[PDB]
Amino acid sequence: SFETRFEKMDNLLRDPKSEVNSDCLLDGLDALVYDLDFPALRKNKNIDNFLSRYKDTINKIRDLRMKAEDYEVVKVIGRGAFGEVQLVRHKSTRKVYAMKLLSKFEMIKRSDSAFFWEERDIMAFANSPWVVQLFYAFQDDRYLYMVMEYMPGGDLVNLMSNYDVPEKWARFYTAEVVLALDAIHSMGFIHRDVKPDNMLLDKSGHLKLADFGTCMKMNKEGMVRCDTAVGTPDYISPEVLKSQGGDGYYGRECDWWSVGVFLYEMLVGDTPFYADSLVGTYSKIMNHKNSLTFPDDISKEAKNLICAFLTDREVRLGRNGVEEIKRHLFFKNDQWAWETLRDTVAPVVPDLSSDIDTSNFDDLEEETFPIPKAFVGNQLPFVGFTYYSNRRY
Amino acid sequence: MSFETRFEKMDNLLRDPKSEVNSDCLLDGLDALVYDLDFPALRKNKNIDNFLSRYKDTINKIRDLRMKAEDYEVVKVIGRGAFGEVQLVRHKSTRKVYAMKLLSKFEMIKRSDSAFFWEERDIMAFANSPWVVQLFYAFQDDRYLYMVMEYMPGGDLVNLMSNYDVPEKWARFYTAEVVLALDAIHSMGFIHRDVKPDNMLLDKSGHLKLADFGTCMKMNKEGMVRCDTAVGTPDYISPEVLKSQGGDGYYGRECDWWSVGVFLYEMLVGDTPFYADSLVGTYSKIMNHKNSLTFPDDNDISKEAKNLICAFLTDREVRLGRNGVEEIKRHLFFKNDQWAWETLRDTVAPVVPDLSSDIDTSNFDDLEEEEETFPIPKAFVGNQLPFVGFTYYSN
Numbered sequence: 001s002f003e004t005r006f007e008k009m010d011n012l013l014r015d016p017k018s019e020v021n022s023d024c025l026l027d028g029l030d031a032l033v034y035d036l037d038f039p040a041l042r043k044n045k046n047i048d049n050f051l052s053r054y055k056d057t058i059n060k061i062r063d064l065r066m067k068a069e070d071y072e073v074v075k076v077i078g079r080g081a082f083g084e085v086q087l088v089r090h091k092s093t094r095k096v097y098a099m100k101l102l103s104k105f106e107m108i109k110r111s112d113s114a115f116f117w118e119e120r121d122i123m124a125f126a127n128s129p130w131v132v133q134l135f136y137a138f139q140d141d142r143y144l145y146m147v148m149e150y151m152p153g154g155d156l157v158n159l160m161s162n163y164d165v166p167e168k169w170a171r172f173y174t175a176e177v178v179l180a181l182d183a184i185h186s187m188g189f190i191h192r193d194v195k196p197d198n199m200l201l202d203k204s205g206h207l208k209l210a211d212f213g214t215c216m217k218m219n220k221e222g223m224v225r226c227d228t229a230v231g232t233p234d235y236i237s238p239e240v241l242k243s244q245g246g247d248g249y250y251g252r253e254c255d256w257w258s259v260g261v262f263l264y265e266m267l268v269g270d271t272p273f274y275a276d277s278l279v280g281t282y283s284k285i286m287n288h289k290n291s292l293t294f295p296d297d298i299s300k301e302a303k304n305l306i307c308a309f310l311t312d313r314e315v316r317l318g319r320n321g322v323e324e325i326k327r328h329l330f331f332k333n334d335q336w337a338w339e340t341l342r343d344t345v346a347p348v349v350p351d352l353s354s355d356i357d358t359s360n361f362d363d364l365e366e367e368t369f370p371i372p373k374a375f376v377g378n379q380l381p382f383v384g385f386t387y388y389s390n391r392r393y
Numbered sequence: 394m395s396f397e398t399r400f401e402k403m404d405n406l407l408r409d410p411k412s413e414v415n416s417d418c419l420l421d422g423l424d425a426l427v428y429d430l431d432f433p434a435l436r437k438n439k440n441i442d443n444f445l446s447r448y449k450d451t452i453n454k455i456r457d458l459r460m461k462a463e464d465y466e467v468v469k470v471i472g473r474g475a476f477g478e479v480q481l482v483r484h485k486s487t488r489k490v491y492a493m494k495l496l497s498k499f500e501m502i503k504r505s506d507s508a509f510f511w512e513e514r515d516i517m518a519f520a521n522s523p524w525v526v527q528l529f530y531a532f533q534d535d536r537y538l539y540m541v542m543e544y545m546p547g548g549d550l551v552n553l554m555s556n557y558d559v560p561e562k563w564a565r566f567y568t569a570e571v572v573l574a575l576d577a578i579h580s581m582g583f584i585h586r587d588v589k590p591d592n593m594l595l596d597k598s599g600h601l602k603l604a605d606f607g608t609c610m611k612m613n614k615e616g617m618v619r620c621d622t623a624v625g626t627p628d629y630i631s632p633e634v635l636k637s638q639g640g641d642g643y644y645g646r647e648c649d650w651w652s653v654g655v656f657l658y659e660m661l662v663g664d665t666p667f668y669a670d671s672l673v674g675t676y677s678k679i680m681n682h683k684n685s686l687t688f689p690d691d692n693d694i695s696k697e698a699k700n701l702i703c704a705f706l707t708d709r710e711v712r713l714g715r716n717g718v719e720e721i722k723r724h725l726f727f728k729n730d731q732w733a734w735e736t737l738r739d740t741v742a743p744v745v746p747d748l749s750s751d752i753d754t755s756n757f758d759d760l761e762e763e764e765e766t767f768p769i770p771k772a773f774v775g776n777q778l779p780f781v782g783f784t785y786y787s788n
């Protein structure tokens with residue numbers, strides 16, 4: 001019917017998960033005006049008149065919608081090859097957030113992924129105490145921006161570097177990682193890059209996973225088909241390392257391997273497959289059966305869990321689900337219960353001076369695409385990244 | 394401005410039927426991109442290729458859901474032009490009867506000038522005047538523009554003039570309605586420029602409504618307009634608009650008052666005052682209006698009717714209406730014992746349409762009867778761009 005067609009169309013403009021909602025539609029026009037405003041292209045009157053017709057309007061839209069100059073940057077609290085993370089204060093609301101910026105030029109200059117989409121969706125829609133929340137996502141001709149809740153307690157790399165972690169603390173952080181990974185799995189994703197760097201602590205000292213740039217959606221059988229390896233040299237599973245065009249099919253057990261590496265690191269002080277060279281580390285993982293050893297402190301149960309995860313996928317703990325991990329004797333304690341863990345008092349409670357305290361963050365210190373001679377459409381792969389006008393509430 | 398204010402201003406901009414960035418215009422922007430990029434040559438670029446693949450299913454859905462030409466059953470072609478045609482249509486679902494004006498995008502790109510449709514769109518969508526034909530919906534595809542309007546079944550003033558030797562009392566009525574209708578347009582900030590009987594339509598009641606706003610233009614701060622576009626049949630065009638060709642002149646709304654004088658002369662005399670065989674002959678006669686304007690030797694036209702004609706058929710600087718409508722309204726020609734200006738459209742019209750059905754076309758002269766398209770571009774050309782934001786849906 002006429003009404004049905006009108007309603008279906010109207011719902012499509014409102015749906016926060018729609019490809020044609022107000023955020024996508026505005027991004028689409030913002031892209032066109034960015035990708036056409038070049039003297040070479042303006043020689044074409046269709047383009048020249050269009051740009052002149054939308055001049056005043058696109059300026060208004062640009063000014064009203066969220067932009068980088070709405071944020072006062074306090075400190076850079078993270079860096080990477082394609083971008084950086086910074087502690088910011090929204091000038092109007094005075095609210096404090098952590099903002100992850102990704103260079104559009106660097107992404108386009110061979111990144112063979114579109115990895116930012118799953119990171120946006122996981123944080124935007126997880127709605128889990130175990131996942132860092134996305135409040136807003138915006139962009140300009142140069143960057144992508146992800147306005148997240150600030151985790152002032154820093155990460156587990158920092159914690160491990162300042163403390164000789166006792167077993168009771170390690171039990172706590174491992175248990176929270178197991179619950180957090182299970183939330184991600186329940187959303188139908190394999191993390192593929194579980195490491196202390198991606199384990200963040202809130203004002204309360206409780207864990208939340210961050211950095212979802214390697215997350216991939218599991219298929220019907222809960223599997224992923226990847227021909228090229230993904231993750232970190234130290235925390236990567238044997239199966240993700242050998243993953244090729246012939247084999248390259250794997251499940252969520254790869255995230256359980258990484259937990260075993262994390263546990264080993266907390267209790268031993270080094271990664272189990274550490275070697276001088278990066279290539280030496282690769283050899284040691286592939287030879288885990290002979291290379292995994294313990295120095296001459298760690299309990300019977302802690303050693304058992306480590307070895308239960310640091311095995312071949314076919315005999316790995318968690319191949320039969322989380323309940324076999326949860327029931328492992330290592331977690332046996334008279335302090336917390338799985339179902340109530342995030343309500344307990346954390347082993348290390350952040351002692352923070354202010355809303356912008358950065359004491360848990362170690363002190364940190366561009367080229368764009370050229371002017372196109374013809375239409376190239378560099379803003380097109382980013383249409384619909386905005387999470388502002390059509391948000392879930 | 395606060396964060397909430399900025400969020401709200403942005404949200405209202407997506408809803409405003411007068412906004413350049415509301416939902417329907419934003420959808421046009423994306424529909425344009427998908428039309429103008431889907432070519433194998435351009436698809437060699439992965440930014441374009443991936444984008445098109447990502448929006449494939451969605452753009453198909455949007456195309457199918459939004460108003461399209463196949464929603465309308467075409468009853469009869471009731472008008473034609475260089476760039477299109479007007480047709481009596483029935484919306485297949487609602488069963489409602491409208492008039493639809495079509496404009497060829499290919500033809501508009503070929504012969505340039507692809508901007509005249511905007512003022513006709515705005516005037517009909519937002520006039521909200523009994524003197525202006527209403528726009529219900531405006532839509533488009535890669536080939537045409539469509540304007541869904543209320544059907545004026547009484548035909549136009551060309552048809553009326555051709556079937557009757559118009560008495561002075563009828564001419565007073567139609568001139569008075571034209572004066573009120575032109576004043577409504579002026580009040581919106583527009584100068585019509587080429588007002589003719591073809592533009593004067595009659596509703597089911599026999600009352601006037603202006604239509605065909607292709608030569609319309611928005612007045613500036615001083616209530617003036619300037620143009621460089623050539624003239625098409627000068628019969629009703631004022632000397633100022635004929636002189637201003639190349640943008641060598643700025644003119645006001647008095648140009649529409651001269652056309653009224655031409656219309657009055659035509660109704661009472663039976664011919665246009667400056668007709669000649671050639672188009673250039675007509676232009677010469679208009680430019681020499683001081684010596685070329687004459688009346689036939691028949692007592693028939695009254696003192697007052699002859700005076701009004703001459704008061705409008707003069708140079709802009711001495712033309713009736715240079716000081717506003719009230720000097721036109723007060724002209725002795727309109728002095729009558731039948732109607733009042735403020736109540737005119739409530740009076741009984743001199744000719745009341747007698748119609749057989751909702752699709753009666755008896756007042757429309759029978760219209761007769763291949764579409765050339767743009768070629769496959771080797772690079773990005775952006776032919777859909779001058780039409781972004783033309784879509785309009787009433788509620």
Ligand SMILES: CS(=O)(=O)Nc1cccc(CC(=O)Nc2cc(-c3ccnc(F)c3)cs2)c1
Nearest residue numbers: 079080081082083084085098149150151210211
């Ligand atoms: C490797 S990359 O260049 O593709 N992307 C990238 C750029 C900068 C930093 C990182 C690492 C990273 O993901 N850091 C993150 C920090 C936070 C974050 C969230 C809340 N509070 C914080 F303090 C930090 C979320 S992800 C990756």
Ligand SMILES: CS(=O)(=O)Nc1cccc(CC(=O)Nc2cc(-c3ccnc(F)c3)cs2)c1
Nearest residue numbers: 473474475476477478479492543544545604605
């Ligand atoms: C001069 S052009 O080719 O650029 N445009 C054009 C094309 C076809 C027809 C016309 C003339 C025209 O606009 N006629 C109109 C008729 C009606 C109309 C409205 C309501 N009921 C009707 F019966 C007719 C509105 S405009 C112009």
